[PDB]
DNA sequence: TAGGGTTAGGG
C-alpha cells in the first residue's frame, strides 16, 4: 500500500448535481475506490464544485489520468494529483502548469542529465539550463517543459529527484510576477 | 476547481 496522498485525485469543476455516489460511479471504472467525496458547504449543503477520489493503488490513479478527458454527470471535470494540505500552503501549488523549476543542480549538469531522469514522467518539450547573462557562469538551476500538466503534477508531489548524481529540488515554475506576489 | 471537527504538549 502506497501513501494515501499518492493514491488520491482532486476533481475540480464538478457539476452542481454530482454526489459522492455519482462520482464513485464514474471513477470506480478505473479501479477500486477506498475513498470518494464531494465537498459542500457545511451550512447550505450546496456543492463546492470539487471533490476527491482515492484508489487502492497509484497504478489505478495513473490509469484514471490516462483516461482524460473525464465527463461526470454531463460535465467535463478536471482531475489533478492531490496536493497535500502542507504543500497547498505553497504559492502556486495548485496551478496548472507544464513547466518545472529544478534547483540545486551541479555546474557540470548537461541536458541529458535532466532527460535521463525526467523523461520517465512524460514527453519533454524544452530543457533550459540557466547561465548568467554576460558572465556565462552556470546559475545552478534549470527549467523543463512537458506536454502534459500531469507530468509536472506527478513530479512535484514526490519529495526527491536525482539528477547528475544528486538530489535537486523541483517546483512548479512561477512567472516573475507570480513570485513577486508571493515574495 | 484545494480537503472531511485534519497540525505545537507537557515536562
Tab-separated table of N, CA, C and O in Angstrom, chain A residues 51-181:
chain	number	residue	atom	x	y	z
A	51	UNK	N	-14.136	17.659	-5.459
A	51	UNK	CA	-14.120	16.557	-4.521
A	51	UNK	C	-12.864	15.732	-4.674
A	51	UNK	O	-11.917	16.147	-5.343
A	52	UNK	N	-12.845	14.566	-4.050
A	52	UNK	CA	-11.684	13.695	-4.152
A	52	UNK	C	-12.083	12.245	-4.333
A	52	UNK	O	-13.150	11.818	-3.885
A	53	UNK	N	-11.229	11.495	-5.015
A	53	UNK	CA	-11.436	10.066	-5.185
A	53	UNK	C	-10.078	9.444	-4.884
A	53	UNK	O	-9.035	9.967	-5.297
A	54	UNK	N	-10.083	8.350	-4.138
A	54	UNK	CA	-8.836	7.687	-3.788
A	54	UNK	C	-8.907	6.241	-4.236
A	54	UNK	O	-9.876	5.536	-3.934
A	55	UNK	N	-7.899	5.807	-4.990
A	55	UNK	CA	-7.856	4.431	-5.483
A	55	UNK	C	-7.023	3.543	-4.566
A	55	UNK	O	-6.303	4.038	-3.699
A	56	UNK	N	-7.122	2.230	-4.759
A	56	UNK	CA	-6.360	1.278	-3.951
A	56	UNK	C	-4.875	1.262	-4.319
A	56	UNK	O	-4.044	0.800	-3.530
A	57	UNK	N	-4.539	1.762	-5.508
A	57	UNK	CA	-3.145	1.786	-5.962
A	57	UNK	C	-2.845	2.993	-6.855
A	57	UNK	O	-3.739	3.529	-7.503
A	58	UNK	N	-1.582	3.406	-6.909
A	58	UNK	CA	-1.204	4.536	-7.754
A	58	UNK	C	-1.325	4.136	-9.222
A	58	UNK	O	-1.590	4.971	-10.079
A	59	UNK	N	-1.139	2.855	-9.513
A	59	UNK	CA	-1.269	2.378	-10.889
A	59	UNK	C	-2.687	2.697	-11.360
A	59	UNK	O	-2.900	3.069	-12.511
A	60	UNK	N	-3.656	2.550	-10.459
A	60	UNK	CA	-5.046	2.840	-10.792
A	60	UNK	C	-5.248	4.336	-10.984
A	60	UNK	O	-6.037	4.764	-11.828
A	61	UNK	N	-4.529	5.139	-10.206
A	61	UNK	CA	-4.625	6.587	-10.350
A	61	UNK	C	-4.091	6.942	-11.731
A	61	UNK	O	-4.683	7.756	-12.449
A	62	UNK	N	-2.970	6.328	-12.105
A	62	UNK	CA	-2.366	6.597	-13.407
A	62	UNK	C	-3.310	6.191	-14.542
A	62	UNK	O	-3.389	6.877	-15.555
A	63	UNK	N	-4.024	5.081	-14.377
A	63	UNK	CA	-4.977	4.647	-15.403
A	63	UNK	C	-6.079	5.706	-15.549
A	63	UNK	O	-6.463	6.077	-16.666
A	64	UNK	N	-6.583	6.199	-14.421
A	64	UNK	CA	-7.632	7.217	-14.453
A	64	UNK	C	-7.154	8.453	-15.214
A	64	UNK	O	-7.852	8.958	-16.091
A	65	UNK	N	-5.955	8.928	-14.896
A	65	UNK	CA	-5.425	10.109	-15.571
A	65	UNK	C	-5.162	9.881	-17.067
A	65	UNK	O	-5.292	10.808	-17.872
A	66	UNK	N	-4.803	8.659	-17.447
A	66	UNK	CA	-4.557	8.379	-18.862
A	66	UNK	C	-5.893	8.294	-19.615
A	66	UNK	O	-5.914	8.167	-20.840
A	67	UNK	N	-7.000	8.381	-18.878
A	67	UNK	CA	-8.335	8.305	-19.474
A	67	UNK	C	-9.003	9.666	-19.678
A	67	UNK	O	-10.203	9.745	-19.939
A	68	UNK	N	-8.238	10.740	-19.538
A	68	UNK	CA	-8.786	12.070	-19.757
A	68	UNK	C	-9.158	12.155	-21.239
A	68	UNK	O	-8.563	11.472	-22.067
A	69	UNK	N	-10.150	12.985	-21.594
A	69	UNK	CA	-10.972	13.864	-20.756
A	69	UNK	C	-12.000	13.077	-19.955
A	69	UNK	O	-12.507	12.052	-20.420
A	70	UNK	N	-12.321	13.578	-18.766
A	70	UNK	CA	-13.300	12.945	-17.897
A	70	UNK	C	-14.588	13.751	-17.816
A	70	UNK	O	-14.574	14.933	-17.476
A	71	UNK	N	-15.702	13.097	-18.127
A	71	UNK	CA	-17.005	13.741	-18.086
A	71	UNK	C	-17.829	13.086	-16.984
A	71	UNK	O	-18.046	11.880	-16.996
A	72	UNK	N	-18.275	13.884	-16.024
A	72	UNK	CA	-19.059	13.354	-14.921
A	72	UNK	C	-20.395	14.069	-14.867
A	72	UNK	O	-20.449	15.292	-14.802
A	73	UNK	N	-21.478	13.299	-14.912
A	73	UNK	CA	-22.817	13.880	-14.874
A	73	UNK	C	-23.005	14.932	-15.965
A	73	UNK	O	-23.592	15.984	-15.728
A	74	UNK	N	-22.495	14.636	-17.156
A	74	UNK	CA	-22.633	15.548	-18.277
A	74	UNK	C	-21.753	16.788	-18.272
A	74	UNK	O	-21.934	17.679	-19.103
A	75	UNK	N	-20.803	16.845	-17.345
A	75	UNK	CA	-19.894	17.981	-17.222
A	75	UNK	C	-18.448	17.492	-17.310
A	75	UNK	O	-18.093	16.475	-16.712
A	76	UNK	N	-17.620	18.194	-18.081
A	76	UNK	CA	-16.219	17.808	-18.188
A	76	UNK	C	-15.586	18.333	-16.910
A	76	UNK	O	-15.693	19.520	-16.611
A	77	UNK	N	-14.954	17.447	-16.146
A	77	UNK	CA	-14.320	17.840	-14.890
A	77	UNK	C	-12.799	17.892	-15.057
A	77	UNK	O	-12.277	17.514	-16.100
A	78	UNK	N	-12.090	18.355	-14.033
A	78	UNK	CA	-10.639	18.422	-14.121
A	78	UNK	C	-9.922	17.664	-13.002
A	78	UNK	O	-9.739	18.180	-11.898
A	79	UNK	N	-9.517	16.417	-13.279
A	79	UNK	CA	-8.812	15.574	-12.305
A	79	UNK	C	-7.376	16.062	-12.188
A	79	UNK	O	-6.762	16.412	-13.195
A	80	UNK	N	-6.847	16.073	-10.967
A	80	UNK	CA	-5.482	16.518	-10.720
A	80	UNK	C	-4.892	15.714	-9.565
A	80	UNK	O	-5.615	15.303	-8.670
A	81	UNK	N	-3.581	15.496	-9.574
A	81	UNK	CA	-2.956	14.782	-8.461
A	81	UNK	C	-3.271	15.614	-7.221
A	81	UNK	O	-3.208	16.839	-7.270
A	82	UNK	N	-3.608	14.960	-6.115
A	82	UNK	CA	-3.932	15.688	-4.883
A	82	UNK	C	-2.677	16.230	-4.202
A	82	UNK	O	-1.755	15.481	-3.883
A	83	UNK	N	-2.657	17.537	-3.979
A	83	UNK	CA	-1.544	18.207	-3.316
A	83	UNK	C	-1.834	18.196	-1.817
A	83	UNK	O	-2.914	18.593	-1.398
A	84	UNK	N	-0.871	17.760	-1.010
A	84	UNK	CA	-1.074	17.700	0.439
A	84	UNK	C	-1.445	19.045	1.050
A	84	UNK	O	-1.086	20.104	0.525
A	85	UNK	N	-2.152	19.005	2.178
A	85	UNK	CA	-2.547	20.237	2.845
A	85	UNK	C	-1.312	21.093	3.129
A	85	UNK	O	-1.358	22.308	2.979
A	86	UNK	N	-0.203	20.463	3.515
A	86	UNK	CA	1.037	21.209	3.776
A	86	UNK	C	1.545	21.890	2.491
A	86	UNK	O	1.852	23.085	2.480
A	87	UNK	N	1.634	21.137	1.399
A	87	UNK	CA	2.134	21.726	0.157
A	87	UNK	C	1.187	22.756	-0.440
A	87	UNK	O	1.616	23.648	-1.164
A	88	UNK	N	-0.096	22.627	-0.128
A	88	UNK	CA	-1.121	23.532	-0.634
A	88	UNK	C	-0.950	24.940	-0.090
A	88	UNK	O	-1.610	25.872	-0.543
A	89	UNK	N	-0.070	25.081	0.892
A	89	UNK	CA	0.192	26.371	1.508
A	89	UNK	C	1.215	27.124	0.669
A	89	UNK	O	1.390	28.334	0.810
A	90	UNK	N	1.891	26.392	-0.208
A	90	UNK	CA	2.905	26.976	-1.063
A	90	UNK	C	2.313	27.743	-2.231
A	90	UNK	O	1.324	27.325	-2.831
A	91	UNK	N	2.917	28.889	-2.563
A	91	UNK	CA	2.453	29.725	-3.671
A	91	UNK	C	2.429	28.941	-4.980
A	91	UNK	O	3.397	28.257	-5.317
A	92	UNK	N	1.315	29.032	-5.699
A	92	UNK	CA	1.183	28.347	-6.976
A	92	UNK	C	1.096	26.834	-6.944
A	92	UNK	O	1.115	26.190	-7.995
A	93	UNK	N	0.993	26.257	-5.752
A	93	UNK	CA	0.913	24.809	-5.608
A	93	UNK	C	-0.205	24.169	-6.433
A	93	UNK	O	-0.077	23.026	-6.870
A	94	UNK	N	-1.294	24.908	-6.653
A	94	UNK	CA	-2.435	24.374	-7.396
A	94	UNK	C	-2.553	24.841	-8.837
A	94	UNK	O	-3.571	24.607	-9.478
A	95	UNK	N	-1.514	25.491	-9.353
A	95	UNK	CA	-1.538	25.966	-10.734
A	95	UNK	C	-1.445	24.828	-11.737
A	95	UNK	O	-0.826	23.789	-11.476
A	96	UNK	N	-2.075	25.017	-12.887
A	96	UNK	CA	-1.999	24.023	-13.944
A	96	UNK	C	-0.856	24.565	-14.799
A	96	UNK	O	-1.022	25.578	-15.478
A	97	UNK	N	0.310	23.922	-14.721
A	97	UNK	CA	1.482	24.348	-15.487
A	97	UNK	C	2.194	23.148	-16.121
A	97	UNK	O	2.089	22.026	-15.626
A	98	UNK	N	2.926	23.407	-17.204
A	98	UNK	CA	3.656	22.365	-17.917
A	98	UNK	C	5.156	22.483	-17.695
A	98	UNK	O	5.921	21.651	-18.179
A	99	UNK	N	5.569	23.505	-16.948
A	99	UNK	CA	6.983	23.752	-16.708
A	99	UNK	C	7.384	23.672	-15.242
A	99	UNK	O	6.657	24.134	-14.363
A	100	UNK	N	8.554	23.090	-14.987
A	100	UNK	CA	9.077	22.978	-13.627
A	100	UNK	C	10.415	23.683	-13.475
A	100	UNK	O	11.209	23.758	-14.420
A	101	UNK	N	10.646	24.177	-12.266
A	101	UNK	CA	11.883	24.830	-11.867
A	101	UNK	C	12.654	23.696	-11.189
A	101	UNK	O	12.101	22.996	-10.333
A	102	UNK	N	13.906	23.491	-11.588
A	102	UNK	CA	14.742	22.454	-10.986
A	102	UNK	C	15.916	23.202	-10.365
A	102	UNK	O	16.751	23.761	-11.083
A	103	UNK	N	15.978	23.210	-9.036
A	103	UNK	CA	17.031	23.947	-8.362
A	103	UNK	C	18.079	23.137	-7.638
A	103	UNK	O	17.791	22.084	-7.068
A	104	UNK	N	19.307	23.645	-7.664
A	104	UNK	CA	20.401	22.981	-6.986
A	104	UNK	C	21.097	21.928	-7.819
A	104	UNK	O	21.421	20.856	-7.307
A	105	UNK	N	21.316	22.213	-9.101
A	105	UNK	CA	22.000	21.257	-9.963
A	105	UNK	C	23.468	21.647	-10.092
A	105	UNK	O	23.803	22.835	-10.099
A	106	UNK	N	24.333	20.638	-10.166
A	106	UNK	CA	25.767	20.852	-10.286
A	106	UNK	C	26.109	21.653	-11.526
A	106	UNK	O	25.392	21.604	-12.522
A	107	UNK	N	27.225	22.370	-11.451
A	107	UNK	CA	27.712	23.201	-12.544
A	107	UNK	C	27.929	22.422	-13.832
A	107	UNK	O	27.707	22.946	-14.925
A	108	UNK	N	28.362	21.173	-13.709
A	108	UNK	CA	28.623	20.360	-14.889
A	108	UNK	C	27.377	19.646	-15.409
A	108	UNK	O	27.471	18.767	-16.265
A	109	UNK	N	26.208	20.016	-14.895
A	109	UNK	CA	24.985	19.376	-15.355
A	109	UNK	C	24.701	19.745	-16.806
A	109	UNK	O	24.764	20.920	-17.190
A	110	UNK	N	24.374	18.731	-17.598
A	110	UNK	CA	24.073	18.904	-19.010
A	110	UNK	C	22.656	18.399	-19.272
A	110	UNK	O	22.112	17.621	-18.479
A	111	UNK	N	22.056	18.850	-20.372
A	111	UNK	CA	20.689	18.467	-20.708
A	111	UNK	C	20.359	16.985	-20.600
A	111	UNK	O	19.291	16.625	-20.106
A	112	UNK	N	21.260	16.118	-21.049
A	112	UNK	CA	20.980	14.693	-20.965
A	112	UNK	C	20.788	14.251	-19.509
A	112	UNK	O	20.074	13.285	-19.237
A	113	UNK	N	21.430	14.944	-18.573
A	113	UNK	CA	21.273	14.587	-17.165
A	113	UNK	C	19.805	14.791	-16.786
A	113	UNK	O	19.205	13.959	-16.106
A	114	UNK	N	19.234	15.908	-17.228
A	114	UNK	CA	17.831	16.211	-16.947
A	114	UNK	C	16.897	15.244	-17.672
A	114	UNK	O	15.917	14.767	-17.091
A	115	UNK	N	17.206	14.924	-18.927
A	115	UNK	CA	16.384	13.991	-19.704
A	115	UNK	C	16.328	12.602	-19.103
A	115	UNK	O	15.257	11.994	-19.010
A	116	UNK	N	17.495	12.086	-18.730
A	116	UNK	CA	17.603	10.755	-18.139
A	116	UNK	C	16.621	10.542	-17.003
A	116	UNK	O	16.002	9.483	-16.899
A	117	UNK	N	16.487	11.546	-16.145
A	117	UNK	CA	15.586	11.446	-15.002
A	117	UNK	C	14.139	11.818	-15.293
A	117	UNK	O	13.219	11.081	-14.940
A	118	UNK	N	13.936	12.961	-15.936
A	118	UNK	CA	12.586	13.451	-16.201
A	118	UNK	C	11.746	12.816	-17.306
A	118	UNK	O	10.513	12.882	-17.257
A	119	UNK	N	12.378	12.202	-18.301
A	119	UNK	CA	11.593	11.590	-19.365
A	119	UNK	C	10.690	10.480	-18.831
A	119	UNK	O	9.650	10.177	-19.422
A	120	UNK	N	11.081	9.879	-17.714
A	120	UNK	CA	10.280	8.812	-17.120
A	120	UNK	C	8.889	9.332	-16.766
A	120	UNK	O	7.953	8.550	-16.620
A	121	UNK	N	8.760	10.652	-16.631
A	121	UNK	CA	7.487	11.270	-16.260
A	121	UNK	C	6.608	11.791	-17.387
A	121	UNK	O	5.439	12.114	-17.168
A	122	UNK	N	7.162	11.893	-18.590
A	122	UNK	CA	6.371	12.377	-19.707
A	122	UNK	C	7.212	12.887	-20.858
A	122	UNK	O	8.439	12.878	-20.796
A	123	UNK	N	6.541	13.343	-21.907
A	123	UNK	CA	7.203	13.868	-23.097
A	123	UNK	C	7.736	15.274	-22.851
A	123	UNK	O	6.974	16.212	-22.612
A	124	UNK	N	9.055	15.419	-22.901
A	124	UNK	CA	9.681	16.717	-22.685
A	124	UNK	C	9.693	17.559	-23.958
A	124	UNK	O	10.068	17.080	-25.035
A	125	UNK	N	9.283	18.817	-23.833
A	125	UNK	CA	9.266	19.727	-24.968
A	125	UNK	C	10.486	20.650	-24.987
A	125	UNK	O	11.058	20.900	-26.052
A	126	UNK	N	10.888	21.152	-23.821
A	126	UNK	CA	12.038	22.055	-23.740
A	126	UNK	C	12.833	21.901	-22.449
A	126	UNK	O	12.270	21.644	-21.385
A	127	UNK	N	14.151	22.050	-22.557
A	127	UNK	CA	15.033	21.972	-21.399
A	127	UNK	C	15.885	23.232	-21.459
A	127	UNK	O	16.433	23.566	-22.510
A	128	UNK	N	15.985	23.937	-20.341
A	128	UNK	CA	16.763	25.170	-20.292
A	128	UNK	C	17.627	25.233	-19.035
A	128	UNK	O	17.105	25.403	-17.937
A	129	UNK	N	18.940	25.094	-19.198
A	129	UNK	CA	19.873	25.177	-18.075
A	129	UNK	C	20.320	26.632	-18.044
A	129	UNK	O	20.910	27.134	-19.005
A	130	UNK	N	20.039	27.311	-16.939
A	130	UNK	CA	20.342	28.726	-16.842
A	130	UNK	C	21.774	29.134	-16.525
A	130	UNK	O	22.452	28.530	-15.690
A	131	UNK	N	22.214	30.180	-17.223
A	131	UNK	CA	23.545	30.754	-17.060
A	131	UNK	C	23.382	32.257	-16.881
A	131	UNK	O	22.361	32.827	-17.270
A	132	UNK	N	24.386	32.896	-16.295
A	132	UNK	CA	24.331	34.332	-16.076
A	132	UNK	C	24.475	35.090	-17.390
A	132	UNK	O	25.283	34.730	-18.243
A	133	UNK	N	23.683	36.145	-17.536
A	133	UNK	CA	23.709	36.980	-18.735
A	133	UNK	C	25.034	37.741	-18.819
A	133	UNK	O	25.288	38.641	-18.020
A	134	UNK	N	25.880	37.376	-19.776
A	134	UNK	CA	27.147	38.070	-19.929
A	134	UNK	C	28.318	37.438	-19.204
A	134	UNK	O	29.470	37.610	-19.604
A	135	UNK	N	28.028	36.713	-18.129
A	135	UNK	CA	29.058	36.034	-17.350
A	135	UNK	C	29.330	34.646	-17.927
A	135	UNK	O	30.470	34.184	-17.971
A	136	UNK	N	28.266	33.990	-18.373
A	136	UNK	CA	28.393	32.656	-18.931
A	136	UNK	C	28.359	31.613	-17.832
A	136	UNK	O	28.206	30.422	-18.088
A	137	UNK	N	28.512	32.072	-16.597
A	137	UNK	CA	28.502	31.204	-15.429
A	137	UNK	C	27.177	30.471	-15.265
A	137	UNK	O	26.107	31.037	-15.504
A	138	UNK	N	27.256	29.212	-14.847
A	138	UNK	CA	26.065	28.402	-14.605
A	138	UNK	C	25.423	28.940	-13.329
A	138	UNK	O	26.121	29.266	-12.367
A	139	UNK	N	24.100	29.033	-13.310
A	139	UNK	CA	23.424	29.555	-12.134
A	139	UNK	C	22.919	28.489	-11.157
A	139	UNK	O	22.414	28.820	-10.088
A	140	UNK	N	23.064	27.220	-11.520
A	140	UNK	CA	22.642	26.142	-10.637
A	140	UNK	C	21.170	25.751	-10.664
A	140	UNK	O	20.666	25.159	-9.702
A	141	UNK	N	20.472	26.081	-11.749
A	141	UNK	CA	19.063	25.719	-11.873
A	141	UNK	C	18.659	25.634	-13.338
A	141	UNK	O	19.376	26.113	-14.222
A	142	UNK	N	17.517	25.005	-13.587
A	142	UNK	CA	17.026	24.823	-14.938
A	142	UNK	C	15.508	24.762	-14.976
A	142	UNK	O	14.858	24.703	-13.929
A	143	UNK	N	14.965	24.759	-16.191
A	143	UNK	CA	13.527	24.667	-16.433
A	143	UNK	C	13.280	23.522	-17.394
A	143	UNK	O	14.038	23.320	-18.345
A	144	UNK	N	12.235	22.748	-17.139
A	144	UNK	CA	11.897	21.653	-18.029
A	144	UNK	C	10.418	21.756	-18.319
A	144	UNK	O	9.603	21.845	-17.394
A	145	UNK	N	10.077	21.758	-19.603
A	145	UNK	CA	8.688	21.866	-20.025
A	145	UNK	C	8.232	20.547	-20.614
A	145	UNK	O	8.948	19.958	-21.426
A	146	UNK	N	7.047	20.095	-20.202
A	146	UNK	CA	6.456	18.848	-20.684
A	146	UNK	C	5.236	19.159	-21.551
A	146	UNK	O	4.832	20.314	-21.680
A	147	UNK	N	4.643	18.125	-22.135
A	147	UNK	CA	3.474	18.305	-22.989
A	147	UNK	C	2.169	18.059	-22.223
A	147	UNK	O	1.079	18.287	-22.747
A	148	UNK	N	2.287	17.601	-20.981
A	148	UNK	CA	1.115	17.301	-20.149
A	148	UNK	C	1.313	17.881	-18.747
A	148	UNK	O	2.323	17.612	-18.122
A	149	UNK	N	0.363	18.679	-18.258
A	149	UNK	CA	0.482	19.273	-16.925
A	149	UNK	C	0.535	18.184	-15.853
A	149	UNK	O	1.042	18.408	-14.753
A	150	UNK	N	-0.013	17.013	-16.159
A	150	UNK	CA	0.011	15.921	-15.197
A	150	UNK	C	1.434	15.407	-14.954
A	150	UNK	O	1.734	14.906	-13.871
A	151	UNK	N	2.309	15.521	-15.956
A	151	UNK	CA	3.694	15.080	-15.776
A	151	UNK	C	4.300	15.947	-14.672
A	151	UNK	O	4.994	15.458	-13.781
A	152	UNK	N	4.013	17.238	-14.729
A	152	UNK	CA	4.504	18.167	-13.725
A	152	UNK	C	3.910	17.846	-12.357
A	152	UNK	O	4.632	17.771	-11.365
A	153	UNK	N	2.597	17.650	-12.304
A	153	UNK	CA	1.946	17.341	-11.030
A	153	UNK	C	2.503	16.053	-10.432
A	153	UNK	O	2.756	15.986	-9.234
A	154	UNK	N	2.701	15.039	-11.267
A	154	UNK	CA	3.250	13.766	-10.804
A	154	UNK	C	4.633	13.929	-10.194
A	154	UNK	O	4.992	13.221	-9.250
A	155	UNK	N	5.414	14.840	-10.762
A	155	UNK	CA	6.758	15.102	-10.284
A	155	UNK	C	6.797	15.883	-8.975
A	155	UNK	O	7.396	15.439	-8.007
A	156	UNK	N	6.153	17.043	-8.938
A	156	UNK	CA	6.231	17.872	-7.750
A	156	UNK	C	5.660	17.284	-6.471
A	156	UNK	O	6.043	17.709	-5.385
A	157	UNK	N	4.757	16.313	-6.581
A	157	UNK	CA	4.202	15.685	-5.388
A	157	UNK	C	5.240	14.766	-4.732
A	157	UNK	O	5.137	14.475	-3.544
A	158	UNK	N	6.238	14.307	-5.496
A	158	UNK	CA	7.298	13.458	-4.928
A	158	UNK	C	8.306	14.360	-4.216
A	158	UNK	O	8.491	15.504	-4.606
A	159	UNK	N	8.994	13.845	-3.202
A	159	UNK	CA	9.934	14.689	-2.477
A	159	UNK	C	11.325	14.796	-3.064
A	159	UNK	O	11.883	15.884	-3.132
A	160	UNK	N	11.879	13.666	-3.483
A	160	UNK	CA	13.234	13.633	-4.011
A	160	UNK	C	13.323	13.371	-5.505
A	160	UNK	O	12.503	12.643	-6.080
A	161	UNK	N	14.338	13.976	-6.119
A	161	UNK	CA	14.592	13.827	-7.551
A	161	UNK	C	16.096	13.877	-7.707
A	161	UNK	O	16.729	14.838	-7.265
A	162	UNK	N	16.655	12.838	-8.324
A	162	UNK	CA	18.097	12.725	-8.513
A	162	UNK	C	18.506	13.026	-9.952
A	162	UNK	O	18.071	12.362	-10.892
A	163	UNK	N	19.348	14.039	-10.105
A	163	UNK	CA	19.820	14.497	-11.407
A	163	UNK	C	21.330	14.702	-11.341
A	163	UNK	O	21.832	15.395	-10.447
A	164	UNK	N	22.048	14.114	-12.288
A	164	UNK	CA	23.503	14.246	-12.312
A	164	UNK	C	24.075	13.787	-10.969
A	164	UNK	O	24.916	14.455	-10.360
A	165	UNK	N	23.571	12.644	-10.513
A	165	UNK	CA	24.031	12.029	-9.278
A	165	UNK	C	23.576	12.581	-7.943
A	165	UNK	O	23.837	11.958	-6.915
A	166	UNK	N	22.905	13.730	-7.928
A	166	UNK	CA	22.483	14.307	-6.655
A	166	UNK	C	21.053	14.823	-6.624
A	166	UNK	O	20.460	15.132	-7.655
A	167	UNK	N	20.506	14.907	-5.419
A	167	UNK	CA	19.146	15.391	-5.256
A	167	UNK	C	19.031	16.847	-5.685
A	167	UNK	O	19.958	17.643	-5.499
A	168	UNK	N	17.890	17.191	-6.266
A	168	UNK	CA	17.619	18.566	-6.669
A	168	UNK	C	16.185	18.844	-6.250
A	168	UNK	O	15.396	17.909	-6.102
A	169	UNK	N	15.860	20.118	-6.028
A	169	UNK	CA	14.511	20.499	-5.622
A	169	UNK	C	13.714	20.841	-6.869
A	169	UNK	O	14.212	21.516	-7.765
A	170	UNK	N	12.473	20.374	-6.930
A	170	UNK	CA	11.646	20.623	-8.100
A	170	UNK	C	10.309	21.251	-7.714
A	170	UNK	O	9.576	20.726	-6.879
A	171	UNK	N	9.999	22.388	-8.324
A	171	UNK	CA	8.748	23.080	-8.029
A	171	UNK	C	8.073	23.474	-9.324
A	171	UNK	O	8.690	23.433	-10.390
A	172	UNK	N	6.805	23.848	-9.236
A	172	UNK	CA	6.089	24.301	-10.422
A	172	UNK	C	6.707	25.655	-10.747
A	172	UNK	O	7.019	26.434	-9.835
A	173	UNK	N	6.916	25.929	-12.034
A	173	UNK	CA	7.530	27.191	-12.436
A	173	UNK	C	6.545	28.345	-12.328
A	173	UNK	O	5.446	28.262	-12.859
A	174	UNK	N	6.950	29.406	-11.631
A	174	UNK	CA	6.134	30.608	-11.465
A	174	UNK	C	6.772	31.764	-12.233
A	174	UNK	O	7.992	31.906	-12.248
A	175	UNK	N	5.951	32.593	-12.867
A	175	UNK	CA	6.465	33.737	-13.617
A	175	UNK	C	7.096	34.722	-12.649
A	175	UNK	O	6.891	34.635	-11.440
A	176	UNK	N	7.851	35.676	-13.180
A	176	UNK	CA	8.495	36.678	-12.336
A	176	UNK	C	7.455	37.412	-11.498
A	176	UNK	O	7.686	37.717	-10.328
A	177	UNK	N	6.302	37.683	-12.103
A	177	UNK	CA	5.224	38.386	-11.422
A	177	UNK	C	4.539	37.547	-10.352
A	177	UNK	O	4.200	38.057	-9.284
A	178	UNK	N	4.321	36.267	-10.638
A	178	UNK	CA	3.660	35.398	-9.674
A	178	UNK	C	4.451	35.311	-8.373
A	178	UNK	O	3.889	35.447	-7.284
A	179	UNK	N	5.757	35.106	-8.486
A	179	UNK	CA	6.605	35.005	-7.305
A	179	UNK	C	6.663	36.323	-6.559
A	179	UNK	O	6.701	36.348	-5.329
A	180	UNK	N	6.670	37.418	-7.313
A	180	UNK	CA	6.709	38.749	-6.728
A	180	UNK	C	5.501	38.924	-5.812
A	180	UNK	O	5.601	39.527	-4.742
A	181	UNK	N	4.359	38.390	-6.241
A	181	UNK	CA	3.135	38.475	-5.453
A	181	UNK	C	3.220	37.496	-4.285
A	181	UNK	O	2.445	37.580	-3.333
